[PDB]
Amino acid sequence: GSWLEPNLNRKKKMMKGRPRVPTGGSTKGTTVVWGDYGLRMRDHHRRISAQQLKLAEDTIKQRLRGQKYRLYKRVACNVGVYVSGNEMRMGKGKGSFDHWATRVAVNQIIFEIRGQLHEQVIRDAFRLAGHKLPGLYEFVKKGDPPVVGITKLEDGLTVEDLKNPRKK
């Protein structure tokens, strides 16, 4: 399939669910792994649609057209969102398929980029993509430390320090 159209059945209805909320110190998906720069969702955990991620991709291509770059996607739309009619009454079963979506935890990377381009030219492409995506986004470089929840592990900070009851 694709990162926007999975090889799943639209008839099997999926429960709403919730995005992951790491409460045990997990940094899963909070670092740049493939590209040199990344786009991080820094505010809150959300469920992004496939039409919003497609527009974000078009915005990065429209701004970087005519140049050499490699765009990576770290999210996959594998969550079916079934919307019942707004004009319908409550009950009478679950709604029909509307669109695909993906659940993203806080401080996770959405897009990564690698190419022979200038940093400022990539900051603008991610700035525009962030403007059109739901929530607040941030520019990240490869090598930056991971994030535990909403706290960055900077200046020798470790996960065991965040778990230690004594922190004063």
Partner RNA sequence: AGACAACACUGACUAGGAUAGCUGGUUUUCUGCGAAACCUAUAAUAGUAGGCAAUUUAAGUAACAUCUUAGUAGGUACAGAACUUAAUCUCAGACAAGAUGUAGAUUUUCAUACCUAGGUAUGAAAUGCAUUUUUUUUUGUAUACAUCGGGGGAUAUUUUAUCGGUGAGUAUGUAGACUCGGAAUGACAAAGAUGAAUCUUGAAUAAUCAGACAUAGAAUGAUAAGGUUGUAUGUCAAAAGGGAAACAGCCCAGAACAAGAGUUAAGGUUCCAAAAUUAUUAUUAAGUGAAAUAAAGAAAGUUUUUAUAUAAGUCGACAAGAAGAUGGGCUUGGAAGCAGCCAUAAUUUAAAGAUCUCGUAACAGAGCACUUGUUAAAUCUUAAAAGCAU
Partner RNA sequence: AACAAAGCACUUUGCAAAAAGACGAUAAGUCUAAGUAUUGAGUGUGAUUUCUGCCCGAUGCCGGCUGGUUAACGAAUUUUCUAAAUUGAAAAAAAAUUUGGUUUCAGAGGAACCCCCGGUUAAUGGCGGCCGGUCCUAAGGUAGCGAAAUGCCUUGGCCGUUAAAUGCGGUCUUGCAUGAAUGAUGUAACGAUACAACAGCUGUCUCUAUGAUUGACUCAGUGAAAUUGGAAUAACUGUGCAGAUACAGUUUACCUCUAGUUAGACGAGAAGACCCUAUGCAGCUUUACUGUUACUAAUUAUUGAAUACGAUU
Partner RNA sequence: AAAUUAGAUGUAAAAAAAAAAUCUUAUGAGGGCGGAUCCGCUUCUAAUAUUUUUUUGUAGUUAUUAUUAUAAUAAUAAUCAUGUUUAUUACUUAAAAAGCUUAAUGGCUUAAUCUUGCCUUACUGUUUGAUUAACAACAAAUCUUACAGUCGCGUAAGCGGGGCAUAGGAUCACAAGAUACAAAAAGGAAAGAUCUUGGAUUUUUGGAAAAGCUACGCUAGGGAUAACAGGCUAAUUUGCGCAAGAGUGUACAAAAUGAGUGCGCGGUUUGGCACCUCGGCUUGACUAAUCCUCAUGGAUGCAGAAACUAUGUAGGGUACGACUGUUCGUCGAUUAAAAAGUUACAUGAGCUGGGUUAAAUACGUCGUGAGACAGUAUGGUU
Shortest distance, CB of residue 166 to RNA, whole angstroms? 19
In the window 93-152, what residues touch Mg ion (CB under 5 A)? 133
Question: With contact defined as beta carbons under 8 Å apart, do 109 and 77 qualify?
Answer: no
Asked if 150 is part of the footprint of RNA (rule: CB under 7 A), the reply reads: no
Considering only the stretches 19-27, 115-123, 150-158, 160-168, report the one whose residues sit in contact with RNA under the rule CB under 7 A.
19-27
Contacts of 156 (CB under 8 A, 6+ apart): none
Considering only the stretches 12-20, 115-123, 150-158, 160-168, report the one whose residues sit in contact with RNA under the rule CB under 7 A.
12-20
Nearest position to Mg ion, beta carbon: 133
Q: How far apart are CA 94 and CA 107, in angstroms?
A: 32
Q: Give the position of tokens 């603008």.
A: 124
Asked if 40 is part of the footprint of RNA (rule: CB under 7 A), the reply reads: no
CB atoms within 10 A of CB 89: 7
| Binding partner of 30, given RNA, Mg ion, none, CB within 5-8 angstroms per partner class | RNA
Q: Of 8, 36, 144, 145, which lies in the binding site for RNA, with binding defined by CB under 7 A?
A: 8
Asked if 163 is part of the footprint of RNA (rule: CB under 7 A), the reply reads: no
Q: Give the position of tokens 């490869």.
A: 142
- DSSP H or E segment with residue 30: none
